[PDB]
Design a protein around this motif. Structure first.
Motif, mmCIF file in Angstrom:
data_model
loop_
_atom_site.group_PDB
_atom_site.id
_atom_site.type_symbol
_atom_site.label_atom_id
_atom_site.label_comp_id
_atom_site.label_asym_id
_atom_site.label_seq_id
_atom_site.Cartn_x
_atom_site.Cartn_y
_atom_site.Cartn_z
ATOM 1 N N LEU A 1 -1.802 -4.146 5.656
ATOM 2 C CA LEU A 1 -1.006 -3.477 6.677
ATOM 3 C C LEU A 1 -0.683 -2.048 6.283
ATOM 4 O O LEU A 1 -0.759 -1.133 7.109
ATOM 5 C CB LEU A 1 0.285 -4.252 6.922
ATOM 6 N N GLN A 2 -0.360 -1.834 5.018
ATOM 7 C CA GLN A 2 0.073 -0.518 4.594
ATOM 8 C C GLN A 2 -1.087 0.455 4.471
ATOM 9 O O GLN A 2 -0.935 1.635 4.799
ATOM 10 C CB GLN A 2 0.813 -0.632 3.269
ATOM 11 N N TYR A 3 -2.254 -0.006 4.027
ATOM 12 C CA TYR A 3 -3.324 0.925 3.704
ATOM 13 C C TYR A 3 -4.581 0.788 4.544
ATOM 14 O O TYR A 3 -5.348 1.757 4.600
ATOM 15 C CB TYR A 3 -3.707 0.805 2.222
ATOM 16 N N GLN A 4 -4.779 -0.337 5.235
ATOM 17 C CA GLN A 4 -6.052 -0.706 5.868
ATOM 18 C C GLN A 4 -7.204 -0.586 4.879
ATOM 19 O O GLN A 4 -8.191 0.116 5.101
ATOM 20 C CB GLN A 4 -6.324 0.088 7.146
ATOM 21 N N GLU A 5 -7.042 -1.272 3.756
ATOM 22 C CA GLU A 5 -8.028 -1.385 2.722
ATOM 23 C C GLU A 5 -7.775 -2.743 2.097
ATOM 24 O O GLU A 5 -6.607 -3.138 1.964
ATOM 25 C CB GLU A 5 -7.915 -0.276 1.673
ATOM 26 N N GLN B 1 -1.584 -9.265 2.690
ATOM 27 C CA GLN B 1 -1.619 -8.840 4.071
ATOM 28 C C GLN B 1 -0.669 -7.674 4.296
ATOM 29 O O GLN B 1 -0.925 -6.828 5.156
ATOM 30 C CB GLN B 1 -1.298 -10.036 4.957
ATOM 31 N N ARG B 2 0.400 -7.587 3.500
ATOM 32 C CA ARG B 2 1.229 -6.390 3.492
ATOM 33 C C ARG B 2 0.473 -5.187 2.965
ATOM 34 O O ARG B 2 0.614 -4.084 3.509
ATOM 35 C CB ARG B 2 2.475 -6.626 2.647
ATOM 36 N N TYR B 3 -0.333 -5.386 1.924
ATOM 37 C CA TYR B 3 -1.132 -4.288 1.394
ATOM 38 C C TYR B 3 -2.134 -3.805 2.426
ATOM 39 O O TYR B 3 -2.324 -2.593 2.607
ATOM 40 C CB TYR B 3 -1.863 -4.730 0.136
ATOM 41 N N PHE C 1 -2.136 -7.906 11.298
ATOM 42 C CA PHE C 1 -1.321 -8.552 10.274
ATOM 43 C C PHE C 1 -0.997 -9.997 10.641
ATOM 44 O O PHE C 1 -1.338 -10.938 9.906
ATOM 45 C CB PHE C 1 -0.043 -7.732 10.100
ATOM 46 N N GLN D 1 -3.659 -5.264 -8.942
ATOM 47 C CA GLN D 1 -2.267 -5.128 -8.571
ATOM 48 C C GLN D 1 -1.766 -6.343 -7.809
ATOM 49 O O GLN D 1 -0.578 -6.662 -7.898
ATOM 50 C CB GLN D 1 -2.101 -3.830 -7.795
ATOM 51 N N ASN E 1 -3.610 6.921 5.825
ATOM 52 C CA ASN E 1 -2.941 5.831 6.509
ATOM 53 C C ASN E 1 -1.539 5.611 5.964
ATOM 54 O O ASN E 1 -0.639 5.248 6.724
ATOM 55 C CB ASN E 1 -3.756 4.559 6.376
ATOM 56 N N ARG F 1 -0.619 -14.533 0.041
ATOM 57 C CA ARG F 1 -1.272 -14.082 1.268
ATOM 58 C C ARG F 1 -0.433 -13.035 1.976
ATOM 59 O O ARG F 1 -0.968 -12.058 2.510
ATOM 60 C CB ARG F 1 -1.526 -15.260 2.201
ATOM 61 N N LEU F 2 0.888 -13.212 1.964
ATOM 62 C CA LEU F 2 1.777 -12.236 2.575
ATOM 63 C C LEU F 2 1.766 -10.907 1.832
ATOM 64 O O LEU F 2 1.844 -9.851 2.463
ATOM 65 C CB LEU F 2 3.176 -12.839 2.658
ATOM 66 N N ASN G 1 1.442 -18.923 0.013
ATOM 67 C CA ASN G 1 1.910 -18.271 1.236
ATOM 68 C C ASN G 1 2.424 -16.866 0.950
ATOM 69 O O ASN G 1 2.086 -15.907 1.658
ATOM 70 C CB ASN G 1 2.996 -19.108 1.898
ATOM 71 N N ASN H 1 -7.434 -13.932 0.977
ATOM 72 C CA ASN H 1 -7.401 -12.785 1.865
ATOM 73 C C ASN H 1 -8.654 -12.733 2.718
ATOM 74 O O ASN H 1 -8.624 -13.162 3.883
ATOM 75 C CB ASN H 1 -7.201 -11.509 1.040
#
Lengths: 199, 230, 239, 248, 213, 228, 204, 201, 238
Positions: free
Chosen positions: D96-100, D92-94, G68, D106, A82, D88-89, D85, D66
């Motif tokens: 978005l990047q990995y779908q995990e 949610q970025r993580y 997202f 980290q 991904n 959570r961002l 906030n 999360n």
């Protein structure tokens, strides 16, 4: 142009590349390697514009190594796949687009073996066996004729022997020698180099 | 001579240029707001300095949308700036979601705005505490914020001079279950408890929040009601 | 002229915060490091296990690559940021010229970043001093140290933290020519350094090794008990 | 003497604002999480227990961040919103990047770096907020972490808040448990800790708050539990107090 | 549409001698099927030991001349000494590559003396490569002039003809004859000739006219 | 008072530059002597520990194939300046196919030896000796933190520079020879140092027009030491 | 077309008190298929699905981007999302790329969070919403599904006849389609439960 | 234009022609294509002059900075890597550059091939230019690993002679360089007509 | 005295003491004297050294083919204004293809130096320029100041103990206008020899002379065309 084949097994992933680096008339390099060892159980193969292949090797290989040295453990094949798809999709819509064709081979402690399949339009896919080029077609006919999900690794090697015997019979291309890896519970084991005297 | 200014903590305590802003808020004009079963009633205390001033110019009870009332207790020139901010922000929400913004979400974003202004170190914070209310999804709400960027949720509260006395009266007189009119009555009572006595249709200014929407009442119905309401 | 700020000199030609930021290191935990001829080894003291939590997160010895090893002193947060930056620097160097990263280049990076970080306007300098151990060029063992001013300074053995003068003074009386290799004598040399530590509690010792070709190996608190036992045996044989 | 800003040092080398941020931590709400397998808990003390509130938020210190992680918080309350906030961002970025889902360590170090960048830089107010971490991963299971305004973070199994919780940590060491993953046992232990450490006479349930996190078949749900089981927990602990006065 | 280029023409000659550098060029500036003037010397004296000629697009020739003079003054006023010839060659090469993606459509020849006191001709190209040669012909009349210089200077394709080094006056007669012979057949050539000679004692100039058509 | 670079004195002057000149003094000494045969140069290392590896501490670095350097003061400001000179020399060779002469090197360094500015950072704390051979023979060059660069025939820096200059002007004249200047310099070194002079204390750097490469002496310096 | 690069077909049909969404399974290049397990229907909260057809890259990227912003919205506000809120969010996400457009045709199918009220809408590649009551379709094949759904739809439909109607419509329209085929996934949801079936399609 | 390079036991052979035309017009006959990067690195000029000259001069700059920062001679793969990463930043903007990178390494001999298309590979034999395929033929006729020194010299000389014989875009002086373990050395600069008289009979 | 710290702060008497402190910083430079004829402008400065072995610090530096400057004060600001000066020369040399009039150049110098005297964050420039040039109306000798009030003169002198030089200019400003170059230059050093204490003599190595003429390019000299200028002198009247 050329094609690197990627058969999934029950607990192994059988990948097999070529060793050709020709330039429009002549074969410049007859012992080429396109195999990119990401980590202890995750491989990557690359076919496309040969200025971009080295760049993906740098970026993806080294950034996955960066994750490994940062956190302390190895990625899943899914998250790495991904990550690659996200990077291609982002670098697609720019003044510098990337045009390669990837396919991903990994192995999990939980998910076991894994195969992924890219495109030059950055699509994920979870396939049993993949295709690119024109060896795409000539492999996919026999390979979908003789696939069993419960196949042994020696039957897979024998199937690859048979398919290569069919590849050396009806192409325009030369493709003399194919290099082969395998992934197991241990890791990346290189099998013997697979070449053929034709006649 | 310390704190001074906004970049350092105290040796042990809290932030002096927030505490003094709260002190200037507490030195502001009295007001009261009561959450009833069906609506929420806001009301202020607006005495002109002389008999020269006009009461159709500046307006304390101010709508943010057609269903959200909002009053303050503090300094008007900052009040207008943060109200205009809330206007634009609620319109951005209505651009994105095409739906009227909930009051909790307003309080989130307005609180983030005020907390951003309390961030170090070049501007002062507001001298403004808010009272936000509205009838969103049937149940009405009542949200009081402060210059420190925090917020609360009340059944009934007050802000301004003698707010402790008004709070003891609202603790005593008010309860959970009333109507809009009964809330109006006890709100005018707790406002007249601490104001000066010369209270007309103009010295107070009342906005209500029905489930039919926000409503900012007129001096006609005010003098209809407050003509010796008890 | 004063302890503020970082930018002006003393009237006799000093920088106060450069001199004062080393005191945070000098009041910090002790971590030593020596080089063998083939196997390099180091360790920190004061594990300080407080009986109710895990300590796998407080590890003060890490790596940027498979060829280089870390240590530090002073406060932990600056070490966290500097190492997290240095990993990306090592990997960016790997993205460039395809060698394994030399210890000298990455020490020049870290000390240079630390210095040009110090020179700027009102940035609190990283009060750490790192130990950067590697054996790259045909397995040539190297270890450099850093400074809050940002001066890489190549040694053969090293000792920082609390009481570093005494701990380094033990290596003056210990470090003869025929230390290594002789890997077993380098092992006993690390053991004698841990016995010469400021507390030498026996269980608060944490040491990590590198044989210049393998990976980082964290040892076990039974091998070290045997090392303390044979060191006490050598002390009895001195009698 | 050498006060003025967060940066630069006082000559020891010690610091000014990290110490004063911890002394800002100490006068705040008390929270805790316990040693538990097959689940983990959080406790919290209700500040401002005045009768004219609404409690229609269901959560005042807990923030289900999360999916499989919540966080208690303590300190300056608006900076907690600012950090939550952003956190959570980050998560949610993580995703978005990995779908995990984010494996929490980290995540913790990222928030610690966010706080630390305001520790070094100048002249900015550092976040005078410590906050907790519960969560689950693919690599270690149920976890506990302690964020600090220095940027240091501690992996605990029984955690620590300020002056109202030093005695709590003393009781946690003197009444240490290991081996029992039974959540009701640790809930009774937490009830005992808040019974002694909070000055609330007989532990009214309106002054307390309890949130738990269990692993259910693929979901890793977070249980912000209601009031009646808290009531019977209080009655259970007071029956245990009657069991304690059986020695008289 | 607007085109950014136009071909002005020109003809530049250079000869590297034993201790001399002769650079000569006609002074016709033309465009399409008309004559703008009959007096515009393509040759320019930089120092006591360096002469440059520039043909091709005339505006870029002027601009490049001014920029080169500016950087000459920069080097001297920074470093208290004049440049050599090859240093100017490297500098011009770096400039011509510095406008790679919008090139100067300009041929360039630098002639001059080295530090040994010998002739050195550096040829160029519109993109910025260079080399130290003995003789070049730049402009539209390049092919009309190069094989004759191969015949005389290089003595190429000859049998039993020994190598005599090129003198000064023989080279002057060569330059006069080659510009007459090229002016008979080229259309971008005539009416004059600006001959510049670099010695170890300074720069000599000489104007030889031609036919007026 | 005097509190910052943006304020003069009632009589002069900085009053930050002055404290930089004061911060010259803390460093170890170094001596270079210009001789028409070639520039010789020397330094003290001031080794603390036997663990302190002596060839690792840099004092003479190599900027160009015929240009040396020596540093005096803060190590890292000197490293920055050496880095910038190493860049700029190469750019001069790039744009001109020739060697940047050492005076022009020093003008390029002293262009931002004082470009100190925190808005619109601090001034640097090192004085530098430059030795090299331009077209005019060998050159020995002495700059300062304040950028006031001048040529010096035999300059001494750092700690104990006063009696070093004194006994140097005692022994110097214009027509010295090479090895005589070498031993004359190391005499002054072992007069100003506190430790016994041996192979690890000092190091020499000799540049000659016919011996342009290798501006260094390695363990033949032992043989030069034992001749006193 | 660019829409006809990877194929695609998404049908949604509103029933009486329930709603059903179905899509194809084939993924591949212009004529060369690759796999039969490509997801185009993505769960967005409970009892609320979305369908995506067109270019698969824009499909996956838009799905992850919507996931997202959806998780950020549902964690800023503890309630779940209403379908009109989703429709405005998707239209905003598409209209941000007004001149740099993604190549997809999203279809939203979900129920009411408070009542059992069904809902269908579909959007264009620039963010034009459209709510109907009978059916919405998207993808490469259009007119086939339009003819079939205008042929077989009734207003008040029990979930069995709704299921069989969308089944026959999808099977016939996919068998007439060339570049999209190779099996059909069907999601029929309601207030009580969520049913997912796969049909025995022609694999030609 | 035709270059070639092949490595063997005793270092690397580098040879090229010196003809660089301007379309159908010959510009020069004595273009020294094999650009001397260092005392230990040698690059060639293969297709477009300005790109080869500029980017190899920038590579020589960066190698010198690397050496002065690390007190250590740079490796060959390092140079090819930096050159490819520099040239790849103008992909599609129309740079023509097909040089080769040669030098001695700690691993020993070094032979890489860098295009403006970014085709960074190692190998054993290479040949670049219009008449390169002629050189491929005659060299892969004459290639072995265990050749001698004069054998390799006459081999490469034969190779450039054949390439300039059949192609029209190639000619001039035949340069011939030889990389050793310590440093490279120019062997000879031979004109074609001398080789035709010498080898024709 | 708490208001005497920064450039921005007006004094309660209105006198910016930062300017006067910059003036006093200028007064600690070397002696130099500038003076013109109708046809020839000559500026002569004095060199100094750090030590006996050290070289002498140059003062007169080249600028342009018809412009050369003297200097006193700081050196970093001197080379900064030198770079700006050369840039302003070659810019109009590039654009207009003419040599500059001197007056607009020195107005550019004043406008350059105004901003570091009004805003906060940059100190005023300690600077001692004496500028000699040739426009169409002949030679000009301008002088500068850190207050950017540039002055045109016929004969000035700035630096340490330059007052005796100024009195010499007073008693020979009638005589400067008619003479040719040689005795003009020895008038210049008959100001510089009174810029010294009388117990030593002006040598070769300490002086430099720069002549620019209406037909003569600006040229600096040192000991070698100066040993011809150093003859033709008498001793001081002891």
């Amino acid at each position: 142009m050329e094609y690197l084949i990627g058969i999934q097994g029950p607990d192994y992933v059988l990948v097999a590349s070529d060793r050709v680096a020709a330039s429009n008339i002549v074969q410049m390099k007859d012992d080429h390697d396109k195999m990119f060892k990401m980590s202890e159980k995750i491989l990557l193969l690359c076919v496309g514009e040969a200025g971009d292949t080295v760049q993906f090797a740098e970026y993806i290989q080294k950034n996955v190594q960066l994750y490994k040295m940062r956190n302390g453990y190895e990625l899943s094949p899914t998250a790495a796949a991904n990550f690659t798809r996200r990077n291609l999709a982002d670098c697609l819509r720019s003044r510098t687009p990337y045009h390669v064709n990837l396919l991903l081979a990994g192995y999990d402690e939980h998910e076991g073996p894994a195969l992924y399949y890219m495109d030059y339009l950055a699509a994920l896919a979870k396939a049993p066996f993949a295709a690119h080029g024109y060896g795409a077609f000539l492999t996919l006919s026999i390979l979908d004729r003789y696939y069993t999900p419960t196949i042994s690794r020696e039957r897979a090697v024998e199937l690859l022997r048979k398919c290569l015997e069919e590849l050396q019979k009806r192409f325009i291309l030369n493709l003399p020698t194919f290099s082969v890896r395998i992934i197991d519970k241990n890791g990346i084991h290189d099998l013997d180099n697979i070449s053929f005297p034709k006649q | 001579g310390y704190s001074f200014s906004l970049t350092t903590f105290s040796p042990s305590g809290k932030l002096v240029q927030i505490e003094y802003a709260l002190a200037a808020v507490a030195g502001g004009a009295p007001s009261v707001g009561i959450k009833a079963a069906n609506g929420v009633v806001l009301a202020t205390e607006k005495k002109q300095k002389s008999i020269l001033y006009d009461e159709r110019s500046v307006h304390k009870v101010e709508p943010i949308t057609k269903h959200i009332g909002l009053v303050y207790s503090g300094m008007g020139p900052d009040y207008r700036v943060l109200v205009h901010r809330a206007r634009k922000l609620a319109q951005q929400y209505y651009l994105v979601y095409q739906e009227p913004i909930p009051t909790a979400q307003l309080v989130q974003r307005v609180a983030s705005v005020m907390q951003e202004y309390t961030q170090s170190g070049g501007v002062r914070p507001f001298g403004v505490s808010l009272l936000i209310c509205g009838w969103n999804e049937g149940r009405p709400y009542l949200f009081q914020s402060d210059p420190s960027g925090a917020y609360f949720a009340w059944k009934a509260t007050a802000m301004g001079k003698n707010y402790v006395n008004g709070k003891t009266f609202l603790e005593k007189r008010y309860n959970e279950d009333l109507e809009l009119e009964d809330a109006i009555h006890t709100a005018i009572l707790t406002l007249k408890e601490s104001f000066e006595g010369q209270m007309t249709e103009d010295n107070i200014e009342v906005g209500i929040c029905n489930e039919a929407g926000f409503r900012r009442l007129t001096p006609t119905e005010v003098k209809d009601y407050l003509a010796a309401i008890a | 002229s004063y302890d503020r700020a970082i930018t002006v000199f003393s009237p006799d030609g000093h920088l106060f915060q450069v001199e004062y930021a080393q005191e945070a290191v000098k009041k910090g935990s002790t971590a030593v490091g020596v080089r063998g001829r083939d196997i390099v080894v180091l360790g920190v003291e004061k594990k300080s296990v407080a009986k109710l939590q895990d300590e796998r997160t407080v590890r003060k010895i890490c790596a940027l690559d498979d060829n280089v090893c870390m240590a530090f002193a002073g406060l932990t947060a600056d070490a966290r940021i500097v190492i997290n930056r240095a990993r990306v620097e090592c990997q960016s160097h790997r993205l460039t010229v395809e060698d394994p990263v030399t210890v000298e280049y990455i020490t020049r990076y870290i000390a240079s970043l630390k210095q040009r970080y110090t020179q700027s306007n009102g940035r609190r300098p990283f009060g750490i001093s790192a130990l950067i151990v590697g054996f790259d060029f045909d397995g040539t063992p190297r270890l450099y140290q850093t400074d809050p001013s940002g001066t890489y300074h190549a040694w053969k053995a090293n000792a920082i933290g609390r009481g570093a003068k005494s701990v380094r003074e033990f290596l003056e009386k210990n470090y003869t020519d025929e230390a290594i290799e002789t890997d077993d004598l380098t092992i006993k040399l690390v053991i004698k350094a841990l016995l010469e530590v400021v507390q030498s509690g026996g269980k608060n010792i944490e040491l990590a090794v590198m044989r210049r070709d393998q990976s980082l190996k964290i040892l076990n608190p039974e091998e070290i008990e045997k090392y303390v036992a044979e060191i006490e045996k050598e002390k009895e044989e001195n009698e | 003497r050498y006060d003025s800003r967060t940066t630069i040092f006082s000559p020891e080398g010690r610091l000014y604002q990290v110490e004063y941020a911890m002394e800002a931590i100490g006068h705040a709400g008390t929270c805790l999480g316990i040693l538990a397998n097959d689940g983990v808990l959080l406790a919290a003390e209700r500040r401002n227990i005045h009768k004219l509130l609404d409690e229609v938020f269901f959560s005042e210190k807990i923030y289900k961040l999360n999916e499989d992680m919540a966080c208690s918080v303590a300190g300056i309350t608006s900076d907690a919103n600012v950090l939550t906030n952003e956190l959570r961002l980050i998560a949610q970025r993580y995703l978005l990047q990995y779908q995990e889902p984010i494996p929490c360590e980290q995540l913790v170090t990222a928030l610690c770096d966010i706080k630390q960048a305001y520790t070094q830089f100048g002249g900015k107010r550092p976040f005078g907020v410590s906050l907790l971490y519960i969560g689950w991963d693919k690599h270690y299971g149920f976890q506990l972490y302690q964020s600090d305004p220095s940027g240091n973070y501690g992996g605990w199994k029984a955690t620590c808040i300020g002056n109202n919780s030093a005695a709590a940590v003393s009781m946690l060491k003197q009444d240490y448990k290991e081996g029992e993953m039974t959540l009701k046992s640790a809930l009774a232990l937490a009830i005992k800790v808040l019974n002694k450490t909070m000055d609330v006479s007989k532990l009214s349930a309106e002054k307390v708050e309890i949130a738990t996190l269990t692993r259910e078949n693929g979901k890793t749900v977070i249980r912000v539990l209601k009031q009646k089981e808290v009531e019977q927990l209080i009655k259970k602990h007071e029956e245990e107090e009657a069991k304690a006065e059986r020695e008289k | 549409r607007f085109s950014p280029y136009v071909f002005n023409g020109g003809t530049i000659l250079a000869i590297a001698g034993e201790d001399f550098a002769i650079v000569a060029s006609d002074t016709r500036l033309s465009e399409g099927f008309s004559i703008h003037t009959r007096d515009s010397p393509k040759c320019y004296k930089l120092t006591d030991k360096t002469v440059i000629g520039c043909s091709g697009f005339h505006g870029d020739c002027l601009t490049l001349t001014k920029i080169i003079e500016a950087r000459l003054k920069m080097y001297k006023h920074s470093n208290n000494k004049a440049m050599t010839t090859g240093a100017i060659a490297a500098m011009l090469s770096t400039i011509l590559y510095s406008r790679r993606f919008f090139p100067y459509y300009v041929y360039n020849i630098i002639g001059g003396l080295d530090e040994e006191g010998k002739g050195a001709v550096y040829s160029f190209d519109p993109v910025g490569s260079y080399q130290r040669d003995s003789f070049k012909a730049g402009g539209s009349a390049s092919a009309m002039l190069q094989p004759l210089l191969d015949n005389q200077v290089g003595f190429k394709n000859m049998q039993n003809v020994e190598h005599v080094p090129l003198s000064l006056d023989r080279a002057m007669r060569l330059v006069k004859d080659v510009f007459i012979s090229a002016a008979e057949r080229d259309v971008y050539t005539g009416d004059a000739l600006r001959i510049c000679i670099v010695t170890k004692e300074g720069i000599r100039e000489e104007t030889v006219s031609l036919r007026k058509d | 008072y005097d509190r910052g670079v943006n304020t003069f004195s009632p009589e002069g002057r900085l009053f930050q530059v002055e404290y930089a000149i004061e911060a010259i003094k803390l460093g170890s000494t170094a001596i270079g002597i210009q001789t028409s045969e070639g520039v010789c140069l020397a330094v003290e290392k001031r080794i603390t520990s036997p663990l302190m590896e002596p060839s690792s501490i840099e004092k003479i670095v190599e900027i160009d194939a015929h240009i040396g350097c020596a540093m005096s003061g803060l190590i890292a400001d000197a490293k920055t300046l050496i880095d910038k000179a190493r860049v700029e020399t190469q750019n001069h060779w790039f744009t001109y196919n020739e060697t940047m002469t050492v005076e022009s090197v020093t003008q390029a360094v002293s262009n931002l030896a004082l470009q100190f500015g925190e808005e619109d950072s601090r001034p640097f704390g090192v004085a530098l000796l430059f030795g090299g051979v331009d077209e005019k023979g060998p050159q020995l060059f002495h700059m300062d933190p304040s950028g006031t660069f001048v040529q010096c025939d035999a300059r001494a820096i750092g700690s104990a520079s006063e009696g070093a200059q004194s006994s140097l002007q005692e022994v110097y004249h214009k027509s010295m020879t090479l090895k005589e200047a070498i031993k004359s310099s190391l005499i002054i070194l072992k007069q100003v140092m506190e430790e016994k002079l041996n192979a690890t204390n000092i190091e020499l750097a000799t540049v000659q027009p016919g011996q342009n490469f290798h501006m260094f002496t390695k363990e033949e310096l032992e043989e030069v030491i034992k001749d006193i | 077309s660019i829409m006809s690069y990877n194929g695609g077909a998404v049908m949604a049909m509103k029933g009486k008190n329930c709603v059903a969404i179905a899509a194809d399974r084939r993924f591949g290049i212009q004529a060369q298929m690759v796999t039969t397990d490509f997801q185009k229907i993505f769960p967005m909260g409970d009892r609320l699905y979305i369908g995506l057809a067109g270019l698969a890259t824009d499909v996956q990227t838009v799905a992850q981007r919507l996931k997202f912003r959806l998780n950020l919205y549902e964690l800023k506000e503890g309630r779940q999302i209403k379908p009109y809120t989703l429709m405005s969010m998707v239209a905003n996400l598409l209209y941000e790329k007004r001149f740099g457009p993604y190549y997809t045709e999203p279809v939203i199918a979900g129920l009411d969070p408070k009542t059992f009220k069904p809902f269908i809408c579909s959007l264009d590649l620039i963010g034009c919403p459209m709510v109907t009551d009978d059916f919405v379709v998207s993808g490469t094949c259009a007119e086939q599904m339009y003819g079939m759904c205008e042929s077989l739809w009734e207003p008040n439909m029990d979930p069995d006849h709704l299921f069989e109607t969308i089944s026959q419509a999808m099977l016939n329209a996919v068998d007439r389609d060339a570049v999209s085929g190779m099996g059909v996934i069907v999601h029929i949801i309601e207030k009580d439960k969520i049913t997912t079936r796969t049909l025995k399609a022609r694999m030609d | 234009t035709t270059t070639l390079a092949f490595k063997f036991r005793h270092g690397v052979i580098v040879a090229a022609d010196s003809r660089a035309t301007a379309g159908a017009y010959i510009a020069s006959q004595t273009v020294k294509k094999v650009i001397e990067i260092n005392p230990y690195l040698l690059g060639t000029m293969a297709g477009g002059a300005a790109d080869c000259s500029f980017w190899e001069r920038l590579l020589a700059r960066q190698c010198r900075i690397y050496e002065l920062r690390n007190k250590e001679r740079i490796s060959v793969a390092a140079a090819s890597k930096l050159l490819a990463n520099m040239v790849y930043q103008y992909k599609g903007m129309g740079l023509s550059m097909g040089t080769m990178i040669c030098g001695w390494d700690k691993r020993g001999p070094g032979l890489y091939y860098v295009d403006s298309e970014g085709n960074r590979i190692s190998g054993a034999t290479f040949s670049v230019g219009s008449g390169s395929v002629y050189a491929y033929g005659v060299m892969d006729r004459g290639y072995s690993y265990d050749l001698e020194v004069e054998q390799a010299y006459d081999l490469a000389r034969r190779a450039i002679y054949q390439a300039t014989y059949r192609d029209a875009y190639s000619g001039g002086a035949v340069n011939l360089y030889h990389v050793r373990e310590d440093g490279w050395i120019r062997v000879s600069s031979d004109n074609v007509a001398d080789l035709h008289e010498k080898y024709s009979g | 005295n708490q208001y005497d710290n920064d450039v921005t702060v007006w004094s309660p008497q209105g006198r910016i003491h930062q300017i006067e402190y910059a003036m006093e910083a200028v007064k600690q430079g070397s002696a130099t004297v500038g003076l013109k004829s109708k046809t020839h402008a000559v500026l002569v400065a004095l060199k100094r050294a750090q030590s006996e072995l050290a070289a002498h610090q140059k003062k007169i530096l080249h600028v342009d083919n018809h412009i050369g400057i003297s200097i006193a004060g700081l050196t970093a600001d001197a080379r900064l204004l030198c770079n700006f000066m050369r840039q302003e020369c070659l810019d109009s040399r590039f654009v207009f293809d003419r040599p500059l009039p001197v007056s607009r150049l020195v107005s550019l110098i004043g406008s350059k130096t105004q901003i570091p005297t009004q805003r906060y964050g940059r100190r005023p420039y300690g600077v001692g320029l004496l500028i000699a040039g040739y426009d169409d109306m002949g030679p000009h000798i301008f002088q500068t100041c850190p207050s950017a009030n540039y002055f045109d003169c016929r004969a000035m002198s700035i630096g340490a103990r330059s007052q005796s030089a100024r009195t010499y200019l007073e008693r020979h400003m009638s005589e400067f206008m008619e003479c040719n170059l040689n005795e003009l230059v020895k008038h210049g050093l008959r100001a510089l020899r009174e810029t010294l204490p009388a117990e030593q003599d002006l040598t070769t190595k300490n002086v430099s002379i720069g002549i620019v003429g209406k037909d003569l390019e600006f040229t600096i000299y040192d000991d070698d065309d100066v040993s011809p200028f150093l003859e033709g002198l008498e001793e001081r009247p002891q």
